[model samples]
Target: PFKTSFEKWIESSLLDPQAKEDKGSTINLGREGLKNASQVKKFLLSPAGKDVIAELGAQMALQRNINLQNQQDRMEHELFKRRLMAALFLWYLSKKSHAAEKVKEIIREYNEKAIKNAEKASSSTSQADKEIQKMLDEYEQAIKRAQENIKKGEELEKKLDKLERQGKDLEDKYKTYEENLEGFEKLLTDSEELSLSEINEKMKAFSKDSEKLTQLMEKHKGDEKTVQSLQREHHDIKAKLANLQVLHDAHTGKKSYVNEKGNPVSSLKDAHLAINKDQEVVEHKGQFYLLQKGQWDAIKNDPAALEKAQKDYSQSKHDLATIKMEALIHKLSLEMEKQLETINDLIMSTDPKENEEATKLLHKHNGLNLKLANLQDMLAVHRKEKSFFNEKGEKVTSLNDAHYVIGKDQQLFNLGGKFYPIHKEQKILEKDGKFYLLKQGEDWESIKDSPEKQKKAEHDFHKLQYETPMTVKKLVHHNKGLETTIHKERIEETKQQLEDNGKEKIEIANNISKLQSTVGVALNQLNQ
Candidate 1:
């Protein structure tokens, strides 16, 4: 009855015309002969198929037999494929039709009938059979428990192996840290008499080694207390070394204090002596003072002499301040020139940010110019005249003459306020906002009068204007494309790294469970 229902289901689900059309192919089921319902039905009625069914029944019977071990081969014959498919299809039909409970009840009824028949056959041996059956159930359960324990033990072994490897690595790193720390400590002890450069070199080496230790500490963050202590020691040593550097700098006058004459003075007293010696002869604010040995002491007591000296000193200080301001303005002008050059260089940059920065610097340059003009006005100083000269050393009279002189000197041509630095070996003529190219020996004046040359020049100028922007746009797009490709590659690389990290996390979680199991096992063994 089950076989009939199963075959009907298989035909309806897989062999019918609608089913075949829906699936787009015939169901082969890994065999060539039993493709359709008719072929499957004929195979089921055949001798070979009947033999396969009989073997399946025998295996099911052995599963119910308390005395026999169930180790039957289900895939022993050529017809096993059909037999397996039929069994799977029967299961599928039972599940689909919700007939699994009814099937189980029928199997239970058959088992009960078989048990009754076996009991009747072995009436005298029935008690012994029951005892053996009970013992077999316990034995099977014990074997299952043993298999689970073996799996747990293997996992525990893998975890212990990983922990052992981590421990070994940590020990090696600790030993390296200890050895380096010892060397650094000894170096610190011996650095008392070392020169500043030697101490600086040693400090650099120490800093490098300290960075390595910090990285190691980061990797093994569980040892926070030890790492913190080591860091503290490192900081202490660093401070001590820095103090030594400060003492060395002071003793050697490394940071010199310059006087008004730009001479280094070692002490305040020496600076005062140098200044007083200069004041003896030097005029202050158009007032000359001849100082004898104790003239300053004599003037200190006389109110009139002290008032004149104080006025001259105040005037001299004002003059000095002006001189320093002028010097600063000169320095600022030099810097502004370099900045202007940088801005000009960045004018053709493709990056918008660079161009924006250049614009910002140009504004800053103009502001500095205003400040310089104000400072020059305050000092009553006029800016020097700037002269533009031609290659023949003749003075350039106008801006156009200056441009022509620059173009000639640089082997370039000026056309419509634009400079072309290329085609140095060729002659170029500019007329009516157009540029004409000619061979090296051609005269620009003679070619400038031709109509065809004018047309060619106009075409070249228009083409250059069109193509230049297009080429710049292409480069910008190329840069953007490269950036996007690199970004995608980095994302892919990061995704791969995340996947690897996830796998590692899973492994770590497994190791944690294994370690816990191992500890439980060890505790149980101890209790034993």
Candidate 2:
């Protein structure tokens, strides 16, 4: 007989023989793990994956609570140490004379006891007097240590109280700052509302001090100090926060006077006062200035990098434009897919399968795709938007890999700036004009030729100055757009959809009344 042919499969074809990190679902997959494996395992083990894996019906609920409780325990322990030190500080500040008095009392009592002991030791003087003196010496040392601690505690309290007051004053200054900050905040809000801008707004402040600088630098030449100072302040928040956390943790635990080994004794205030002086270090140092300095050094103190920019920017910008073009090619691909879907639907509806309208639509779709592809290759937004480059991170429409890029220095996008219409009841005056972002009376003032504009008149169409009345709609619309569905939107939508579907779409969905009547009639007939 000819040799028998056989086929065999490896473990890859089998269900996942190994266990996954996520386990313990009541209705577990059991041995059927890795149902749909992919080239990348990131999503399988990622935070997002964990979220989906732990969905309502999934197991591992017990472990989650345990982890959460552990985290809470750690935070509570930290809070305890902080509270303890604060308690001790308050005690030291309480004007207690007991500490010093106690030390003196102990010393006096020790001398009296030692003298009494010396009298007892007189008979054995040559042999035991030395031991009695040693006892006295030990008592004296103990009293001295107590005296030293009381002095240190008092001094430490004074310094800490001073720094704490400074912290409070700094906090109060910001309350006034928030009020003065309103006007500029409005201007920033009105900009095209980029994520980068929002993050910057939250983490950084446009200096109230530097606001004075537009006048100062205008009068003085090479006041890099002003620019440097602003940048330093902007960056210092990170370091200041770090130093604060460290000192705060140490203080709360009453770990100040103790060595690095975590003993509790003595003046944390002196150590903290030293930490407080670092406000200057944070005020003066920042990465922005360091990078700027490095650039200056690299360029041999050259003020402008215009020549290098001209060369490097052109190439890089060109390449970026090309990549953008490639991304846009996706538009054509999407168009083609949509057209194909339409064509399929058309084919299903049509008996002819080659009708004139269908043929024309197909032609148009192909032509549009070609045109879109060509535009994808061309560069755009140069002149009016020369100050800023396009936000290049996200494909934008796609949620995946979405990110925001800050505008590079020296680039501005004035035309790209958002425009808001000012209207009054039933009429619109002028349209298509730059909105002036003004700071009016310590708040963001958005004003344009608000033409004694009583309402209705723009290019023959009646327009109303919706100035105040329309703001509710605008604000609501803006806020709504900022909200997302991942956390809350779906449940609400589904509830509404189901209610609508029951009430309107399905047949006999609410025929309970009719059914009740039919049942009554059936009962009547059955009684016969």
Candidate 3:
């Protein structure tokens, strides 16, 4: 039975047509007889197995792409069906009214009548077709001409809009130009180097050029863009031209010494004149004059006349007294007094303040009279010793000559006006015209009118200079003259001692000369 079953199973493959067509075979293996799916996993790492896996992966990718395409197509069909349903609902609503139905029926009736008319017309068509075709061609030609006219009208509308804008723009631009031109004209009027006639000539040319620019601006009815461009260009060019004119019209040469008109040399007329060296006079029209007494009067001749006028003006009008003739001022004053009536008349004729002679004489008379009055007072005091009042005179106000001595030895001695001479040895203290021996304590008593006691005090004041442990007072002297101080005081004191001890006033005065020697010697000892 097993042999039969084996033979029958073997024959069963032949009985199947699909099994007969299959060419299944055993796997080729590196290790023979090992049959498992794990071997395939290992074999897939090889080159041949890798090619098979790649082909299978490619087929799976193709299937995924086809599935995505079918899904997209299904979505599009779904959206289209929804839209179709929406549109159908909108159409149903559009035709839902009775009036819409009635209108649609009327249209259908007209359409059927048109169909009948078209049929009847086609039956008559052989001759009618030729006339209809010719009329249709004429109608097409008329429609084409109308369409071309409409296009041309649209182009004209755009052009009209452009021209309107240009006109408004140009109006504003022209107003600006007018304003700028007016300002430039005003500037030309006030220009320094440009003469009126020359400026006028330039302005005329500018006006002409401006008119030309205006002409160019207005040349076309609608060329605003071109006009504005030219305006900007002309403004720059005009500025350049104006700069050239400004430079050209500037002062071309140095200031002229002689006035000239178109090469015709002319002399300045009636001008205040001076010599070449004199700054106070300026020569004009060949006239000579001087700016003196705050006015210009014509001098008849030039340098000689100028020198003479200057000398006359510079002459001493009232300095009649010479330098060393101070005492002789009263003599001159007498002469002035004798001529007073004439001087007063001259002063009345001109302003005393303005006229040099009048001003000088008035001031000189005032000064001299004042000085003469004072001098006469001083002379009157001494006058009677020589003259009328000599009867009672005992030389009451006689002056005496006193000599000032500043001796060496005493340092920092405030001898009233004169400072002590510098001490080479020990310095001394001095204050308020008195010599001090040390920094502290006054040490003298002048209790009686006894010169011997005064002499003893002076001696003690000088004795302690070597042992004193301090500096003397500093004496400061300032002046422009020569009167010695402490020496004069001591000399006066000596005279007073003579008077207080019962000497006569005149004898006391007479003995002052004899007292000077002892005064200086006592002063020198005290200063030491």
Candidate 4:
């Protein structure tokens, strides 16, 4: 009922052992045969193929109605189960067919060839990668070496620049020291020329001149007093004469006169002109004179006596002027002598303490000189050896080429005749009393024969001999000049004061001489 003929044909053609054996042995499967074989293999392995086989068996059993006959119908159940088993076995045999096996062998061969090609490419790439890695490693090594050389170059450049600056600084300092030394030496020479004894001699001369002026003033003292009295008498006589002349002119009718009453008074016997209510009359030798109460009596009656008094008054005025001039001259001369004495004292007085300090400074200067001499000797030794080092520990044959190194603590190691640059910490070697620079490989190189070294040993030695002493001398002279400066300034100022005083004295002396000559001429005129 479920197509038993189709099942019967599948059992005979596909499931039979002879048919399976023939299908497996066939080698030259055509395209249609290979296609059928591939489909059969794919279908048998699939879950859908197993479900189809199960459905067919179930349908055949339903059609035959095995559930109704099965309890005692053993032959009918056994025959149907066997028919289902044969169909499943036929599907298995189609999967093992010749065409499917041929396709599997071709795929295996293609996979094997692909694996071999991959191995060949991998081996070639590995070799190339090794070469590239070697090149990269060599490039890195070259870069490292270049960086190291650049570092060395930078260090050398910095060191050279520092040494250049130090050399310039030393040159400037030495030049300054030389200039100061010259100035101090000149000052010392000039200061030594000042003499205290010369000032004392000048003082004595001034004293002598002052004594002469005092004597001259003493000689003029009596004349001065007499002239003073004569001056007062002349003033009084002049006023009296003026008043008396006015009254005499009125009395003689030479001029008009009036009284307090505004009435004119004419000539009359025993009558004189009256000016105001405060009036008195005096009768002298028959001449009536109107007088004020505090007025002098009229002297109009004696013309010769008036003329004589006028001459004496004139002489006395001239003598008074002359005496005043002489007195001023005397005062000025005395002041000049006093100023001279002061100048002499200023010159003679030197500070003892300051002199002692100057002496100490000189001793210190001597000590420095000794040290400088030692340094010179050391420099000479270095020059003789031809092995001196600059500030960078590079060798030189001259002190001038050498750099003076002062450490942070202000210690001068080079001055002590050792060559080391502490900042660099460079290695130095001394072999056979000669200096050498220790190279990187522990090699000792002579500093003297280095091409970079300068050979100015003779010039350097002479320069040190000249400059060292000059520097110390400058210090000593500078201190000496400072210590004595105040004293020197005082002496200079006093000298200027004395010079001005002397000029004033000379002018006073000239005035006194002129006044004395005028007095002599006046006295001669008075006597005549």
lDDT of 4 by residue, 55-155 (tens): 22345535535433322123222222222222233222233334333333333433453355446547123543343333333333332332233334334
Q: TM-score of every model?
A: 0.19, 0.17, 0.16, 0.16
- Number of the candidate with higher TM-score, 2 or 4: 2
Clash pairs (backbone) in predicted model 4 = none
Tens-place lDDT per residue, model 3, 268-290, is 12111211112243244653233
Task: Return whichever of 2 and 3 wins on lDDT.
Answer: 3
Best by TM-score: 1
What are the lDDT scores of the predictions, listed in order? 0.43, 0.32, 0.34, 0.37
What is the C-alpha lDDT profile of model 1 across 73-145, one tens digit per residue? 1212222233233323333322334223322333343335345545655824454345434333323333233
Off by over 4 Å in 2: 1-378, 381-528
Q: lDDT (0-100) at residue 165 of candidate 3?
A: 51
Candidate 2 residue-wise lDDT, 39-154, digit = tens: 11211122211122231222443443343333323232222222222222222223233322322332344335435544654723342334323332333333233224333433
Model 2 worst lDDT run, 10 consecutive residues:
1-10
Q: What is the C-alpha local distance difference test score of candidate 2? A: 0.32
Stretches of model 3 off by over 4 angstroms after superposition: 1-135, 183-185, 188-528
Clashing pairs in 1: none
